[PDB]
Design an enzyme around this catalytic site. Structure first.
Site, PDB file in Angstrom:
ATOM      1  N   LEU A   1      30.336 -15.836  -8.759  1.00 13.35           N
ATOM      2  CA  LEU A   1      30.578 -14.587  -9.459  1.00 13.35           C
ATOM      3  C   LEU A   1      30.860 -14.891 -10.927  1.00 13.35           C
ATOM      4  O   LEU A   1      32.015 -15.079 -11.348  1.00 13.35           O
ATOM      5  CB  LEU A   1      31.723 -13.801  -8.814  1.00 13.35           C
ATOM      6  CG  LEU A   1      31.457 -13.184  -7.448  1.00 13.35           C
ATOM      7  CD1 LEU A   1      32.746 -12.691  -6.817  1.00 13.35           C
ATOM      8  CD2 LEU A   1      30.440 -12.059  -7.531  1.00 13.35           C
TER       9      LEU A   1
ATOM     10  N   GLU B   1      30.855 -17.179 -14.152  1.00 13.84           N
ATOM     11  CA  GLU B   1      31.047 -18.520 -14.729  1.00 13.84           C
ATOM     12  C   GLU B   1      32.544 -18.835 -14.667  1.00 13.84           C
ATOM     13  O   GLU B   1      33.215 -18.899 -15.710  1.00 13.84           O
ATOM     14  CB  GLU B   1      30.567 -18.537 -16.218  1.00 13.84           C
ATOM     15  CG  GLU B   1      29.221 -17.865 -16.516  1.00 13.84           C
ATOM     16  CD  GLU B   1      29.176 -16.374 -16.819  1.00 13.84           C
ATOM     17  OE1 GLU B   1      29.779 -15.571 -16.069  1.00 13.84           O
ATOM     18  OE2 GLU B   1      28.490 -16.005 -17.800  1.00 13.84           O
TER      19      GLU B   1
ATOM     20  N   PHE C   1      38.010 -23.247 -14.620  1.00 21.96           N
ATOM     21  CA  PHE C   1      38.873 -23.929 -13.645  1.00 21.96           C
ATOM     22  C   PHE C   1      38.015 -23.826 -12.339  1.00 21.96           C
ATOM     23  O   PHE C   1      36.925 -24.418 -12.293  1.00 21.96           O
ATOM     24  CB  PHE C   1      40.301 -23.239 -13.572  1.00 21.96           C
ATOM     25  CG  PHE C   1      41.542 -23.877 -12.943  1.00 21.96           C
ATOM     26  CD1 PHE C   1      41.464 -24.568 -11.746  1.00 21.96           C
ATOM     27  CD2 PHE C   1      42.803 -23.670 -13.483  1.00 21.96           C
ATOM     28  CE1 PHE C   1      42.614 -25.087 -11.117  1.00 21.96           C
ATOM     29  CE2 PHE C   1      43.952 -24.198 -12.861  1.00 21.96           C
ATOM     30  CZ  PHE C   1      43.846 -24.904 -11.683  1.00 21.96           C
ATOM     31  N   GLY C   2      38.437 -22.952 -11.409  1.00 16.80           N
ATOM     32  CA  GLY C   2      37.961 -22.743 -10.036  1.00 16.80           C
ATOM     33  C   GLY C   2      36.507 -22.563  -9.759  1.00 16.80           C
ATOM     34  O   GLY C   2      35.884 -23.266  -8.943  1.00 16.80           O
TER      35      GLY C   2
ATOM     36  N   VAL D   1      34.474 -18.693  -9.216  1.00 22.38           N
ATOM     37  CA  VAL D   1      34.739 -17.669  -8.228  1.00 22.38           C
ATOM     38  C   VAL D   1      33.458 -17.446  -7.496  1.00 22.38           C
ATOM     39  O   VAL D   1      32.420 -17.362  -8.135  1.00 22.38           O
ATOM     40  CB  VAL D   1      35.308 -16.390  -8.893  1.00 22.38           C
ATOM     41  CG1 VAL D   1      35.562 -15.289  -7.875  1.00 22.38           C
ATOM     42  CG2 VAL D   1      36.587 -16.703  -9.657  1.00 22.38           C
TER      43      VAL D   1
ATOM     44  N   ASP E   1      49.342 -10.880 -20.341  1.00 24.78           N
ATOM     45  CA  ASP E   1      47.940 -10.890 -20.759  1.00 24.78           C
ATOM     46  C   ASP E   1      47.175  -9.630 -20.365  1.00 24.78           C
ATOM     47  O   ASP E   1      46.062  -9.704 -19.863  1.00 24.78           O
ATOM     48  CB  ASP E   1      47.248 -12.158 -20.247  1.00 24.78           C
ATOM     49  CG  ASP E   1      45.953 -12.500 -20.954  1.00 24.78           C
ATOM     50  OD1 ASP E   1      45.654 -11.862 -21.998  1.00 24.78           O
ATOM     51  OD2 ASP E   1      45.223 -13.387 -20.452  1.00 24.78           O
TER      52      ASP E   1
ATOM     53  N   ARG F   1      39.560  -7.287 -20.212  1.00 21.56           N
ATOM     54  CA  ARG F   1      38.900  -8.491 -19.695  1.00 21.56           C
ATOM     55  C   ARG F   1      39.580  -8.928 -18.400  1.00 21.56           C
ATOM     56  O   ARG F   1      38.933  -9.510 -17.541  1.00 21.56           O
ATOM     57  CB  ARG F   1      38.886  -9.633 -20.726  1.00 21.56           C
ATOM     58  CG  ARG F   1      40.262 -10.181 -21.078  1.00 21.56           C
ATOM     59  CD  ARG F   1      40.256 -11.302 -22.075  1.00 21.56           C
ATOM     60  NE  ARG F   1      41.205 -11.032 -23.157  1.00 21.56           N
ATOM     61  CZ  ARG F   1      42.470 -11.439 -23.160  1.00 21.56           C
ATOM     62  NH1 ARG F   1      42.954 -12.133 -22.138  1.00 21.56           N
ATOM     63  NH2 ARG F   1      43.261 -11.154 -24.185  1.00 21.56           N
ATOM     64  N   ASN F   2      40.870  -8.607 -18.250  1.00 21.86           N
ATOM     65  CA  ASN F   2      41.657  -8.931 -17.070  1.00 21.86           C
ATOM     66  C   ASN F   2      41.741  -7.783 -16.048  1.00 21.86           C
ATOM     67  O   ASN F   2      42.360  -7.970 -15.004  1.00 21.86           O
ATOM     68  CB  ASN F   2      43.034  -9.431 -17.468  1.00 21.86           C
ATOM     69  CG  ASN F   2      43.027 -10.850 -17.947  1.00 21.86           C
ATOM     70  OD1 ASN F   2      42.327 -11.729 -17.416  1.00 21.86           O
ATOM     71  ND2 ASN F   2      43.824 -11.105 -18.959  1.00 21.86           N
TER      72      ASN F   2
ATOM     73  N   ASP G   1      43.970 -10.944 -13.326  1.00 22.21           N
ATOM     74  CA  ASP G   1      44.156 -12.026 -14.302  1.00 22.21           C
ATOM     75  C   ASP G   1      43.148 -13.160 -14.070  1.00 22.21           C
ATOM     76  O   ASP G   1      43.167 -13.829 -13.031  1.00 22.21           O
ATOM     77  CB  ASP G   1      45.607 -12.597 -14.300  1.00 22.21           C
ATOM     78  CG  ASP G   1      46.071 -13.274 -15.601  1.00 22.21           C
ATOM     79  OD1 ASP G   1      45.195 -13.709 -16.411  1.00 22.21           O
ATOM     80  OD2 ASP G   1      47.309 -13.359 -15.819  1.00 22.21           O
TER      81      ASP G   1
HETATM   82  C1  LIG Z   1      29.822  -8.259 -11.083  1.00 24.14           C
HETATM   83  N1  LIG Z   1      30.845  -9.297 -11.185  1.00 24.14           N
HETATM   84  C2  LIG Z   1      30.747 -10.473 -11.849  1.00 24.14           C
HETATM   85  N2  LIG Z   1      31.839 -11.216 -11.723  1.00 24.14           N
HETATM   86  C3  LIG Z   1      32.663 -10.473 -10.908  1.00 24.14           C
HETATM   87  C4  LIG Z   1      33.956 -10.994 -10.423  1.00 24.14           C
HETATM   88  C5  LIG Z   1      34.446 -12.214 -10.870  1.00 24.14           C
HETATM   89  C6  LIG Z   1      35.624 -12.731 -10.369  1.00 24.14           C
HETATM   90  C7  LIG Z   1      36.321 -12.032  -9.395  1.00 24.14           C
HETATM   91  O1  LIG Z   1      37.481 -12.504  -8.833  1.00 24.14           O
HETATM   92  C8  LIG Z   1      38.528 -13.078  -9.685  1.00 24.14           C
HETATM   93  C9  LIG Z   1      38.994 -12.043 -10.687  1.00 24.14           C
HETATM   94  C10 LIG Z   1      40.233 -12.537 -11.430  1.00 24.14           C
HETATM   95  N3  LIG Z   1      41.302 -12.849 -10.477  1.00 24.14           N
HETATM   96  C11 LIG Z   1      42.405 -12.081 -10.346  1.00 24.14           C
HETATM   97  O2  LIG Z   1      42.545 -11.052 -10.981  1.00 24.14           O
HETATM   98  C12 LIG Z   1      43.444 -12.494  -9.322  1.00 24.14           C
HETATM   99  C13 LIG Z   1      44.797 -11.870  -9.577  1.00 24.14           C
HETATM  100  C14 LIG Z   1      45.207 -10.739  -8.883  1.00 24.14           C
HETATM  101  C15 LIG Z   1      46.384 -10.090  -9.209  1.00 24.14           C
HETATM  102  C16 LIG Z   1      47.191 -10.594 -10.219  1.00 24.14           C
HETATM  103  O3  LIG Z   1      48.429 -10.010 -10.516  1.00 24.14           O
HETATM  104  C17 LIG Z   1      48.511  -9.187 -11.558  1.00 24.14           C
HETATM  105  F1  LIG Z   1      49.717  -8.665 -11.580  1.00 24.14           F
HETATM  106  F2  LIG Z   1      48.346  -9.809 -12.699  1.00 24.14           F
HETATM  107  F3  LIG Z   1      47.645  -8.193 -11.515  1.00 24.14           F
HETATM  108  C18 LIG Z   1      46.809 -11.734 -10.905  1.00 24.14           C
HETATM  109  C19 LIG Z   1      45.621 -12.363 -10.579  1.00 24.14           C
HETATM  110  C20 LIG Z   1      40.869 -13.951  -9.611  1.00 24.14           C
HETATM  111  C21 LIG Z   1      39.654 -13.537  -8.785  1.00 24.14           C
HETATM  112  C22 LIG Z   1      35.857 -10.790  -8.935  1.00 24.14           C
HETATM  113  C23 LIG Z   1      36.428 -10.010  -7.789  1.00 24.14           C
HETATM  114  N4  LIG Z   1      37.736  -9.873  -7.684  1.00 24.14           N
HETATM  115  O4  LIG Z   1      35.663  -9.481  -6.985  1.00 24.14           O
HETATM  116  C24 LIG Z   1      34.689 -10.273  -9.483  1.00 24.14           C
HETATM  117  C25 LIG Z   1      32.062  -9.290 -10.583  1.00 24.14           C
END
Ligand SMILES: Cn1cnc(-c2ccc(OC3CCN(C(=O)Cc4ccc(OC(F)(F)F)cc4)CC3)c(C(N)=O)c2)c1
Length: 284
Positions: free
Chosen positions: A28, A30, A33-34, A36, A159, A163-164, A177
């Site tokens: 999903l 680029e 770190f991880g 996705v 943050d 974007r987040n 985030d």
């Molecule tokens: C069309 N398209 C192209 N890329 C995407 C895409 C990319 C990464 C994704 O997953 C990552 C998002 C970022 N992440 C998080 O937001 C975790 C977190 C949660 C609460 C949180 O707590 C708080 F309070 F901050 F909200 C903090 C982090 C990690 C997981 C997703 C998805 N969630 O489906 C989608 C869609």
């Protein structure tokens, strides 16, 4: 790390998912770190035999990370709301360690705003309608709702930016985030590294500006140094063309120089849900 979330204590246990139940399809975007991945999750929810999730894989071993991973997971199991990106659980059976999240099909709010904005055709020869006032206010209200939740838990984001934020199944906006956001920071956060509920309401005001500019860069006309200067000097971002004075009044309420003079997120979401309810009369 999250020494700023030390005071928070989760009452519930972290859900463990079996490796077999996770079938990675493809990445999903680029992932930094991880990276996705989009994956099929088996036996996670009873109603949906094989559902879609976002899977974040941890890069490094060592109790440094293994300890951090566990605390991040524990805090995430605690953060559960309609407008907060849902965390499902972890997978410890072998390496790498996985973190499983709810799939948000439309990606981050920034790209979404850009792609549903007036300059959309300029940002895409690529693939090839601008979000209306109500549509913008729905997004704005959904984000504020997530922020009202986190303020209730005494959780500071540090943050908050479009974007987040993520967009999913039918214009559903949730705060997440992706992991220094000087342009979204109040002067006490820049100068003194002080991050509070009040610091987050300022960032919300920047998020509001971002929404009404359809993803434009806050202080786009300035370098990072120029932006720090204007923030500490007391300069406020100009009211977007798309932004009615009623919505601008809220941004200004978030940008009050004195933290204890900034408008509460409860009042902000309340005002936003009311305008979101009845869009104000506005003509450019
Ligand atoms: C069309 N398209 C192209 N890329 C995407 C895409 C990319 C990464 C994704 O997953 C990552 C998002 C970022 N992440 C998080 O937001 C975790 C977190 C949660 C609460 C949180 O707590 C708080 F309070 F901050 F909200 C903090 C982090 C990690 C997981 C997703 C998805 N969630 O489906 C989608 C869609």
């Amino acid at each position: 790390m999250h020494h700023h979330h030390h005071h928070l204590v989760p009452r519930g246990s972290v859900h463990h998912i079996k490796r077999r139940d996770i079938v990675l399809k493809w990445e999903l975007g680029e992932g930094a770190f991880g990276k996705v991945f989009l994956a099929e999750c088996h036996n996670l929810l009873p109603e949906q035999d094989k559902m879609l999730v976002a899977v974040k894989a941890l890069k490094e071993a060592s109790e440094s990370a293994r300890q951090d991973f566990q605390r991040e997971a524990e805090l995430l199991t605690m953060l559960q709301h309609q407008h907060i990106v849902r965390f499902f659980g972890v997978c410890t059976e072998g390496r790498p360690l996985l973190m499983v999240f709810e799939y948000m099909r439309h990606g981050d709010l920034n790209r979404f705003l850009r792609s549903h904005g007036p300059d959309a055709k300029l940002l895409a020869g690529g693939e090839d309608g601008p979000l209306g006032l109500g549509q913008l206010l729905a997004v704005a209200s959904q984000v504020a709702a997530g922020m009202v939740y986190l303020a209730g838990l005494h959780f500071v984001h540090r943050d908050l930016a479009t974007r987040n934020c993520l967009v999913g199944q039918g214009l559903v906006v949730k705060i997440g985030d992706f992991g220094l956001p000087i342009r979204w920071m109040p002067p006490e956060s820049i100068l003194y590294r002080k991050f509070t509920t009040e610091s987050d309401v300022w960032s919300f005001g920047v998020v509001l500006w971002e929404i009404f500019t359809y993803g434009k860069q806050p202080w786009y006309q300035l370098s990072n140094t120029e932006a720090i200067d204007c923030i500490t000097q007391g300069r406020e971002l100009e009211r977007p063309r798309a932004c009615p004075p009623e919505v601008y009044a809220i941004m200004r309420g978030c940008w009050q120089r004195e933290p204890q003079q900034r408008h509460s997120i409860k009042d902000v979401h309340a005002r936003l849900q009311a305008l979101a309810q009845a869009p104000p009369v506005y003509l450019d």
